[PDB]
Amino acid sequence: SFTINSVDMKSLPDWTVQNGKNLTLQCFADVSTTSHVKPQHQMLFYKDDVLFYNISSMKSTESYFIPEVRIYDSGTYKCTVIVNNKEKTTAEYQLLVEGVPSPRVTLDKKEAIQGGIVRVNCSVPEEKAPIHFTIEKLELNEKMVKLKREKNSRDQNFVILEFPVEEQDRVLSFRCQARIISGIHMQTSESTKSELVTVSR
Numbered sequence: 001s002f003t004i005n006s007v008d009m010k011s012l013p014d015w016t017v018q019n020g021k022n023l024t025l026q027c028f029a030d031v032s033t034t035s036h037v038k039p040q041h042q043m044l045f046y047k048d049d050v051l052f053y054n055i056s057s058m059k060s061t062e063s064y065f066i067p068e069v070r071i072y073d074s075g076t077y078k079c080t081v082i083v084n085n086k087e088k089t090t091a092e093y094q095l096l097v098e099g100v101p102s103p104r105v106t107l108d109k110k111e112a113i114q115g116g117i118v119r120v121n122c123s124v125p126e127e128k129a130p131i132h133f134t135i136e137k138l139e140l141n142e143k144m145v146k147l148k149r150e151k152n153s154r155d156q157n158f159v160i161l162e163f164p165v166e167e168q169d170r171v172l173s174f175r176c177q178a179r180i181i182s183g184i185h186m187q188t189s190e191s192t193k194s195e196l197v198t199v200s201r
């Protein structure tokens, strides 16, 4: 006496969003009935086939709010909705968070001395490891990149790169940009073997 016609998910503003913007996910259903009775709905939210939201409600649409959306939020989203029986599940929708928050650059000394070092802390606090960092040392007098040292944090939110003050330095500045692998796909063949070789001694 209940038939669920179609089931759908939507994300607002889009399924592609700028890092840090506000986001809302919706799992609605369309159910036809002859009954007079108010049905119970259960909405189940999956990211990459793992259940992150389980809600039972009288209305046929429910929502989930994602406050400041980061790259670690992108992935495959689908919702399953059940009524009394007859679940139906939505398709897979790719949420793509694009863009990296501008990195925070911090230093140990405001003023250094020749031969000393500067410890450069480049970070992206709002995000999650692993991040790849590129830090360039600029002497302002000549807009040449005096030194370029890239590093790939794996465990952490940031890097700390030590930069040397060479004897011909006056006013220094450090420039960091961070990049993060949004997605990677890697595949393996199966092993194959070869004609036996018979060492004969």
Ligand SMILES: *[C@@H]1O[C@H](CO)[C@@H](O)[C@H](O)[C@H]1NC(C)=O
Residues within 6 Å of the ligand: 020, 021, 022, 067
């Ligand atoms: C995102 O929502 C929060 C509340 O969770 C609000 O304080 C903030 O202003 C919103 N940011 C944007 C970009 O709408």
Ligand SMILES: *[C@@H]1O[C@H](CO)[C@@H](O)[C@H](O)[C@H]1NC(C)=O
Residues within 6 Å of the ligand: 051, 054, 055, 056
């Ligand atoms: C879903 O949530 C309800 C509680 O609201 C629980 O009774 C039910 O077992 C849960 N099922 C799954 C698979 O999450």
Ligand SMILES: *[C@@H]1O[C@H](CO)[C@@H](O)[C@H](O)[C@H]1NC(C)=O
Residues within 6 Å of the ligand: 104, 105, 106, 121, 122, 123, 125, 158
């Ligand atoms: C590096 O800087 C970030 C923010 O700039 C900070 O959260 C982190 O604690 C710093 N690392 C240190 C002090 O070792």
Ligand SMILES: [Cu+2]
Residues within 6 Å of the ligand: 066, 067, 068, 069, 070, 073
């Ligand atoms: Cu979040």
